Amino acid sequence: EAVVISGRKLAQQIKQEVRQEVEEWVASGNKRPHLSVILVGENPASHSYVLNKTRAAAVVGINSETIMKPASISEEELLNLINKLNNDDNVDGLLVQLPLPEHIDERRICNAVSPDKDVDGFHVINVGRMCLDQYSMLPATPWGVWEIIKRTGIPTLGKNVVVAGRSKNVGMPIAMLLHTDGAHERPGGDATVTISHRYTPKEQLKKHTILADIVISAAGIPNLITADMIKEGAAVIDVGINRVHKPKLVGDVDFEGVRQKAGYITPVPGGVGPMTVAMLMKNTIIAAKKVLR
Amino acid sequence: EAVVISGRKLAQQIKQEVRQEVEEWVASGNKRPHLSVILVGENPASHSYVLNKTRAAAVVGINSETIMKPASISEEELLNLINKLNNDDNVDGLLVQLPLPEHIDERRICNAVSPDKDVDGFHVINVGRMCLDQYSMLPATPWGVWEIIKRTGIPTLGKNVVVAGRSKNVGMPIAMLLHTDGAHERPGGDATVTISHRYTPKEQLKKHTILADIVISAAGIPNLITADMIKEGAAVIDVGINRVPKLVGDVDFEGVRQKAGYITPVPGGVGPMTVAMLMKNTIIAAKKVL
Ligand SMILES: NC(=O)c1ccc[n+]([C@@H]2O[C@H](COP(=O)([O-])OP(=O)(O)OC[C@H]3O[C@@H](n4cnc5c(N)ncnc54)[C@H](O)[C@@H]3O)[C@@H](O)[C@H]2O)c1
Ligand SMILES: NC(=O)c1ccc[n+]([C@@H]2O[C@H](COP(=O)([O-])OP(=O)(O)OC[C@H]3O[C@@H](n4cnc5c(N)ncnc54)[C@H](O)[C@@H]3O)[C@@H](O)[C@H]2O)c1
Ligand SMILES: Cc1c(N2CCN(C)CC2)ccc2c3c(c(=O)oc12)CN(C(=O)c1ccc(NS(C)(=O)=O)c(Cl)c1)CC3
Ligand SMILES: Cc1c(N2CCN(C)CC2)ccc2c3c(c(=O)oc12)CN(C(=O)c1ccc(NS(C)(=O)=O)c(Cl)c1)CC3
């Protein structure tokens, strides 16, 4: 039966690294790092996430402020805020919680944030750089996924990976990190990767996962992954966060089933979720160092 | 048995489309599209490709000028050339033949060409936009590969694709187009895509290909793909170009030819498509659509 992986524990380790690196930076006599969050409207979940991020900044000694705005705000105004922040030398990282209200174009907002402060890594230049295997502000969730794999010692070079989901913010970047060259400016995983999505037939998913040393699910579909899909010994990383109904939270994996076949697995809750917030703290210290100028 | 797809004829079809689109465009009173090509040094294969480019441009009614330069050119010079051309409102499309010589940072160069004139689609912004399924100047070989698939009518949505190779110019862009959402601003093929590369073991490659309705091969290895890798009735697209003289694909042509439903030859396959799609991109650039 399968080693469960604590993303809670892993994430706290990473936050320890960041805490130290920030104490170092500051005692060297540099300004304390400052993360600015913009939060629009009242998605409950959005609120929760921003709070996750600001707690985390607190515990690692990063200054934060959430600038909160009414859902009624206009795209043009939001660009104005973002522009103030890009220009404020005190602001190191800057991020816009998502999703934004439908009268606001995300892509244009994401491209508004200065790439050097873009701790979500969603700016088109950061996407370009990442897709060219260049140093970039990597997106927190895919980076977290990669850190779970790397820190658990699960090998990837030569191995087969299947990612369910192909979103630009999660699925695609995971697939990008894992298939790319270990030798490149930003090393990849040298895996053989299969991208599946909402039009992969279930028989086809299974036909691929079955061959996989690593399965990574980011579809938002409970029990999308079940033990008959999963090779014996495989690592299974659960990126999904689904609300089932009192109301709880679950992954795209059949946790109970899958841990019978799998060599490793990540719980939801307590897996990838907290890793996301951890890798965001890493990006903030990186941004404060203007290391990737 | 296996339909051979003529890259020559499809490229010819696309050329005719561009030719007509240029006529209308000039007839509307617009400037004639102009393509500038920079050649550095004397790589024979380079010289050859640049000629195929300017020749294509001439048949479709697009003006070309190749600016050939000594291998010894400084990087600061080339960037100065590029900045001039970027600034010349009569140049619609600019492209730098590859490879450059060792003292030249290719990435600094690709990123120096105006994104709006980047007919090769190699600027980081065009790569980014492509990877977000936005409108972009698509790279010519990948777009060529896609066109061979659409125009031949081979289905992709739901279907299983394997790509051999992961280079930023060919393999990766191909994989991007084929797996992404048909509904996005730049539609993709909604297929299930496996990316393989130099650390995929033959074993693993084969277990993936046998499941593939489309195998696309862009690895630069003679006979990488043999009929036992393929599945009866499957589309096999050979992007490879191997100097063994003679020129051969990644695929074993006569071999695969019997099992494949479709196949593309080398020569006369993807290569001509690349030149066609670049004409498509030059007219787009000229129109300043994006
Ligand atoms: N753990 C984290 O920190 C974190 C961060 C972001 C998102 N998520 C979770 O990951 C999931 C996906 O989020 P997102 O924004 O990346 O995705 P999304 O909602 O934008 O899209 C989900 C993707 O899954 C694909 N998909 C749908 N059905 C599928 C199927 N049957 N098989 C394979 N692929 C299928 C779709 O094609 C799409 O690309 C959600 O549960 C989300 O909450 C988790
Ligand atoms: N038809 C055209 O118009 C056109 C255009 C450009 C390139 N090409 C050809 O495509 C091929 C690839 O060249 P390139 O510049 O795209 O890439 P490249 O030469 O830089 O690298 C080839 C790629 O194949 C991968 N690869 C190597 N061995 C492999 C193996 N055993 N199995 C699977 N993948 C493997 C490598 O990891 C690498 O990503 C060459 O034949 C090249 O001449 C054709
Ligand atoms: C915009 C968005 C999502 N969208 C879903 C629909 N899709 C259409 C777009 C993306 C989906 C997920 C997220 C997430 C975050 C975000 O900031 O935005 C998201 C930030 N996160 C967190 O703060 C977090 C979540 C769960 C945690 N714990 S658990 C319960 O053990 O998993 C912990 Cl500790 C932290 C991760 C998830
Ligand atoms: C820089 C580079 C390559 N490098 C390979 C190593 N890699 C490390 C870098 C890329 C590899 C291939 C190309 C190619 C071109 C280019 O402009 O640059 C390349 C342009 N092309 C052509 O003009 C062409 C080729 C073949 C044709 N016909 S055939 C003989 O039936 O195939 C026809 Cl009609 C046209 C495509 C090939």
mmCIF file of N, CA and C in Angstrom, chain A residues 107 124-125 127-129 131-134 157-158 160 166 168 172 176 179-181 190-195 197-201 204 207-208 211, chain B residues 107 124-125 127-129 131-134 157-158 160 166 168 172 176 179-181 190-201 204 208 211:
data_model
loop_
_atom_site.group_PDB
_atom_site.id
_atom_site.type_symbol
_atom_site.label_atom_id
_atom_site.label_comp_id
_atom_site.label_asym_id
_atom_site.label_seq_id
_atom_site.Cartn_x
_atom_site.Cartn_y
_atom_site.Cartn_z
ATOM 1 N N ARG A 107 -6.759 38.103 -19.177
ATOM 2 C CA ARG A 107 -5.502 38.023 -19.885
ATOM 3 C C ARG A 107 -4.847 39.402 -19.862
ATOM 4 N N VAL A 124 2.285 36.982 -19.993
ATOM 5 C CA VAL A 124 2.606 36.279 -21.230
ATOM 6 C C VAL A 124 4.121 36.106 -21.392
ATOM 7 N N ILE A 125 4.910 37.097 -20.978
ATOM 8 C CA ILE A 125 6.357 36.940 -21.038
ATOM 9 C C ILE A 125 6.859 35.791 -20.144
ATOM 10 N N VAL A 127 5.148 33.273 -19.412
ATOM 11 C CA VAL A 127 4.641 32.033 -19.986
ATOM 12 C C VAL A 127 5.575 31.623 -21.114
ATOM 13 N N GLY A 128 5.901 32.611 -21.961
ATOM 14 C CA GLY A 128 6.853 32.464 -23.048
ATOM 15 C C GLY A 128 8.177 31.911 -22.523
ATOM 16 N N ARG A 129 8.734 32.585 -21.507
ATOM 17 C CA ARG A 129 10.025 32.165 -20.992
ATOM 18 C C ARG A 129 9.952 30.721 -20.492
ATOM 19 N N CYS A 131 7.996 28.440 -21.445
ATOM 20 C CA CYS A 131 7.792 27.477 -22.515
ATOM 21 C C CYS A 131 9.058 27.348 -23.354
ATOM 22 N N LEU A 132 9.982 28.298 -23.182
ATOM 23 C CA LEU A 132 11.271 28.168 -23.827
ATOM 24 C C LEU A 132 12.331 27.600 -22.876
ATOM 25 N N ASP A 133 11.955 27.113 -21.684
ATOM 26 C CA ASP A 133 12.900 26.504 -20.745
ATOM 27 C C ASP A 133 13.901 27.542 -20.239
ATOM 28 N N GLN A 134 13.490 28.811 -20.221
ATOM 29 C CA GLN A 134 14.315 29.872 -19.668
ATOM 30 C C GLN A 134 13.920 30.158 -18.214
ATOM 31 N N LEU A 157 12.949 11.324 -15.223
ATOM 32 C CA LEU A 157 13.697 11.177 -16.465
ATOM 33 C C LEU A 157 13.481 9.803 -17.102
ATOM 34 N N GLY A 158 12.832 9.780 -18.269
ATOM 35 C CA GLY A 158 12.603 8.542 -18.993
ATOM 36 C C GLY A 158 11.235 7.932 -18.702
ATOM 37 N N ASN A 160 6.992 7.736 -17.603
ATOM 38 C CA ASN A 160 5.815 8.201 -18.303
ATOM 39 C C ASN A 160 4.883 8.929 -17.349
ATOM 40 N N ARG A 166 -5.532 20.765 -18.810
ATOM 41 C CA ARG A 166 -4.655 21.447 -19.750
ATOM 42 C C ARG A 166 -4.899 22.936 -19.621
ATOM 43 N N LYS A 168 -4.199 26.726 -18.651
ATOM 44 C CA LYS A 168 -2.988 27.485 -18.888
ATOM 45 C C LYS A 168 -2.292 27.774 -17.563
ATOM 46 N N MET A 172 -1.282 22.882 -18.261
ATOM 47 C CA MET A 172 -0.317 22.995 -19.343
ATOM 48 C C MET A 172 1.088 23.167 -18.762
ATOM 49 N N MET A 176 4.451 21.095 -19.271
ATOM 50 C CA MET A 176 5.641 21.748 -19.765
ATOM 51 C C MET A 176 6.822 21.422 -18.847
ATOM 52 N N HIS A 179 8.160 17.500 -19.141
ATOM 53 C CA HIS A 179 8.642 16.833 -20.344
ATOM 54 C C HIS A 179 9.979 17.423 -20.785
ATOM 55 N N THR A 180 10.357 18.596 -20.245
ATOM 56 C CA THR A 180 11.457 19.352 -20.834
ATOM 57 C C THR A 180 12.832 18.915 -20.330
ATOM 58 N N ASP A 181 13.850 19.445 -20.994
ATOM 59 C CA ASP A 181 15.217 19.007 -20.834
ATOM 60 C C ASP A 181 15.767 19.394 -19.469
ATOM 61 N N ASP A 190 12.382 15.669 -18.115
ATOM 62 C CA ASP A 190 12.788 14.655 -19.072
ATOM 63 C C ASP A 190 11.839 13.461 -19.041
ATOM 64 N N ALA A 191 10.588 13.690 -18.667
ATOM 65 C CA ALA A 191 9.599 12.629 -18.694
ATOM 66 C C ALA A 191 8.947 12.538 -20.077
ATOM 67 N N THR A 192 8.252 11.418 -20.311
ATOM 68 C CA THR A 192 7.404 11.290 -21.474
ATOM 69 C C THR A 192 5.962 11.574 -21.067
ATOM 70 N N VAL A 193 5.421 12.697 -21.543
ATOM 71 C CA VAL A 193 4.212 13.189 -20.921
ATOM 72 C C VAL A 193 3.037 13.091 -21.882
ATOM 73 N N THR A 194 1.889 12.671 -21.351
ATOM 74 C CA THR A 194 0.639 12.653 -22.083
ATOM 75 C C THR A 194 -0.295 13.710 -21.490
ATOM 76 N N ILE A 195 -0.777 14.635 -22.336
ATOM 77 C CA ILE A 195 -1.788 15.615 -21.970
ATOM 78 C C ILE A 195 -3.141 15.045 -22.383
ATOM 79 N N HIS A 197 -7.561 15.753 -21.484
ATOM 80 C CA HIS A 197 -8.441 16.859 -21.144
ATOM 81 C C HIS A 197 -9.893 16.404 -21.317
ATOM 82 N N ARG A 198 -10.820 17.369 -21.288
ATOM 83 C CA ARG A 198 -12.250 17.117 -21.324
ATOM 84 C C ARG A 198 -12.693 16.349 -22.585
ATOM 85 N N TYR A 199 -11.870 16.241 -23.643
ATOM 86 C CA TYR A 199 -12.315 15.428 -24.769
ATOM 87 C C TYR A 199 -11.498 14.162 -24.906
ATOM 88 N N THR A 200 -10.737 13.803 -23.877
ATOM 89 C CA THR A 200 -10.161 12.474 -23.910
ATOM 90 C C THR A 200 -11.249 11.468 -23.540
ATOM 91 N N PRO A 201 -11.452 10.396 -24.327
ATOM 92 C CA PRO A 201 -12.407 9.359 -23.930
ATOM 93 C C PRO A 201 -11.902 8.669 -22.664
ATOM 94 N N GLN A 204 -9.660 6.024 -22.998
ATOM 95 C CA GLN A 204 -8.385 6.472 -23.544
ATOM 96 C C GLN A 204 -7.485 6.986 -22.422
ATOM 97 N N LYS A 207 -6.382 4.001 -20.827
ATOM 98 C CA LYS A 207 -5.384 3.300 -21.627
ATOM 99 C C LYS A 207 -3.999 3.938 -21.437
ATOM 100 N N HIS A 208 -3.951 5.205 -20.980
ATOM 101 C CA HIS A 208 -2.684 5.932 -20.864
ATOM 102 C C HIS A 208 -2.181 5.928 -19.422
ATOM 103 N N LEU A 211 -0.266 3.070 -18.098
ATOM 104 C CA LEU A 211 1.122 2.850 -18.451
ATOM 105 C C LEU A 211 2.010 3.767 -17.625
ATOM 106 N N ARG B 107 18.676 33.399 -29.071
ATOM 107 C CA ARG B 107 17.530 33.837 -28.308
ATOM 108 C C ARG B 107 17.477 35.363 -28.285
ATOM 109 N N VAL B 124 9.569 35.561 -28.106
ATOM 110 C CA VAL B 124 9.062 34.996 -26.866
ATOM 111 C C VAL B 124 7.589 35.372 -26.747
ATOM 112 N N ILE B 125 7.210 36.571 -27.212
ATOM 113 C CA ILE B 125 5.809 36.961 -27.103
ATOM 114 C C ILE B 125 4.927 36.070 -27.970
ATOM 115 N N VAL B 127 5.677 33.031 -28.784
ATOM 116 C CA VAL B 127 5.639 31.724 -28.146
ATOM 117 C C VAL B 127 4.619 31.767 -27.005
ATOM 118 N N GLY B 128 4.711 32.806 -26.171
ATOM 119 C CA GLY B 128 3.765 32.922 -25.087
ATOM 120 C C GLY B 128 2.326 32.875 -25.597
ATOM 121 N N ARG B 129 2.014 33.764 -26.552
ATOM 122 C CA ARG B 129 0.646 33.863 -27.041
ATOM 123 C C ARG B 129 0.196 32.514 -27.566
ATOM 124 N N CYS B 131 1.150 29.612 -26.641
ATOM 125 C CA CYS B 131 0.966 28.678 -25.541
ATOM 126 C C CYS B 131 -0.274 29.015 -24.711
ATOM 127 N N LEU B 132 -0.804 30.247 -24.836
ATOM 128 C CA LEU B 132 -2.056 30.612 -24.188
ATOM 129 C C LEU B 132 -3.230 30.505 -25.167
ATOM 130 N N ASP B 133 -3.016 29.894 -26.332
ATOM 131 C CA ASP B 133 -4.081 29.757 -27.316
ATOM 132 C C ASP B 133 -4.610 31.127 -27.760
ATOM 133 N N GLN B 134 -3.786 32.182 -27.676
ATOM 134 C CA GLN B 134 -4.211 33.433 -28.292
ATOM 135 C C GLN B 134 -3.727 33.496 -29.741
ATOM 136 N N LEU B 157 -10.009 15.641 -32.681
ATOM 137 C CA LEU B 157 -10.733 15.758 -31.421
ATOM 138 C C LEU B 157 -11.013 14.363 -30.871
ATOM 139 N N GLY B 158 -10.655 14.133 -29.612
ATOM 140 C CA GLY B 158 -10.812 12.819 -29.019
ATOM 141 C C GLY B 158 -9.651 11.888 -29.343
ATOM 142 N N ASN B 160 -5.871 10.142 -30.445
ATOM 143 C CA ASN B 160 -4.620 10.028 -29.731
ATOM 144 C C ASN B 160 -3.442 10.327 -30.646
ATOM 145 N N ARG B 166 10.734 17.590 -29.254
ATOM 146 C CA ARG B 166 10.217 18.525 -28.272
ATOM 147 C C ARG B 166 10.968 19.841 -28.419
ATOM 148 N N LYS B 168 11.832 23.630 -29.435
ATOM 149 C CA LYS B 168 10.935 24.750 -29.206
ATOM 150 C C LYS B 168 10.334 25.268 -30.509
ATOM 151 N N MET B 172 7.534 20.973 -29.810
ATOM 152 C CA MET B 172 6.733 21.526 -28.738
ATOM 153 C C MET B 172 5.541 22.271 -29.332
ATOM 154 N N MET B 176 1.641 21.684 -28.793
ATOM 155 C CA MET B 176 0.739 22.711 -28.312
ATOM 156 C C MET B 176 -0.507 22.766 -29.201
ATOM 157 N N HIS B 179 -3.116 19.560 -28.891
ATOM 158 C CA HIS B 179 -3.856 19.154 -27.708
ATOM 159 C C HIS B 179 -4.830 20.229 -27.234
ATOM 160 N N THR B 180 -4.714 21.458 -27.732
ATOM 161 C CA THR B 180 -5.414 22.572 -27.103
ATOM 162 C C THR B 180 -6.858 22.675 -27.589
ATOM 163 N N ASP B 181 -7.617 23.597 -26.991
ATOM 164 C CA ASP B 181 -9.056 23.663 -27.129
ATOM 165 C C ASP B 181 -9.455 24.279 -28.477
ATOM 166 N N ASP B 190 -7.763 19.562 -29.941
ATOM 167 C CA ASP B 190 -8.504 18.835 -28.913
ATOM 168 C C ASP B 190 -8.106 17.358 -28.874
ATOM 169 N N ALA B 191 -6.866 17.055 -29.239
ATOM 170 C CA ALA B 191 -6.427 15.681 -29.224
ATOM 171 C C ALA B 191 -5.689 15.408 -27.917
ATOM 172 N N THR B 192 -5.447 14.124 -27.668
ATOM 173 C CA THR B 192 -4.711 13.652 -26.521
ATOM 174 C C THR B 192 -3.305 13.435 -27.024
ATOM 175 N N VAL B 193 -2.355 14.189 -26.470
ATOM 176 C CA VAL B 193 -1.013 14.232 -27.020
ATOM 177 C C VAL B 193 0.015 13.698 -26.029
ATOM 178 N N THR B 194 0.903 12.832 -26.530
ATOM 179 C CA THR B 194 2.058 12.357 -25.809
ATOM 180 C C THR B 194 3.306 12.984 -26.435
ATOM 181 N N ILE B 195 4.133 13.671 -25.628
ATOM 182 C CA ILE B 195 5.423 14.208 -26.055
ATOM 183 C C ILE B 195 6.514 13.223 -25.652
ATOM 184 N N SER B 196 7.293 12.797 -26.643
ATOM 185 C CA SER B 196 8.436 11.938 -26.428
ATOM 186 C C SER B 196 9.672 12.688 -26.907
ATOM 187 N N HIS B 197 10.856 12.175 -26.593
ATOM 188 C CA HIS B 197 12.060 12.924 -26.884
ATOM 189 C C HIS B 197 13.230 11.993 -26.663
ATOM 190 N N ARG B 198 14.418 12.577 -26.535
ATOM 191 C CA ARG B 198 15.644 11.801 -26.548
ATOM 192 C C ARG B 198 15.775 10.892 -25.317
ATOM 193 N N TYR B 199 14.900 11.008 -24.302
ATOM 194 C CA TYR B 199 15.044 10.146 -23.130
ATOM 195 C C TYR B 199 13.839 9.227 -23.020
ATOM 196 N N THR B 200 13.053 9.200 -24.089
ATOM 197 C CA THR B 200 12.031 8.177 -24.167
ATOM 198 C C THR B 200 12.703 6.903 -24.669
ATOM 199 N N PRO B 201 12.579 5.789 -23.932
ATOM 200 C CA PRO B 201 13.141 4.516 -24.388
ATOM 201 C C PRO B 201 12.309 3.928 -25.534
ATOM 202 N N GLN B 204 9.149 2.458 -24.684
ATOM 203 C CA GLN B 204 8.062 3.326 -24.252
ATOM 204 C C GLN B 204 7.439 4.019 -25.462
ATOM 205 N N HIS B 208 3.387 3.752 -26.895
ATOM 206 C CA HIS B 208 2.530 4.924 -27.020
ATOM 207 C C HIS B 208 1.979 5.086 -28.448
ATOM 208 N N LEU B 211 -0.840 3.211 -29.914
ATOM 209 C CA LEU B 211 -2.150 3.642 -29.470
ATOM 210 C C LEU B 211 -2.575 4.882 -30.251
#
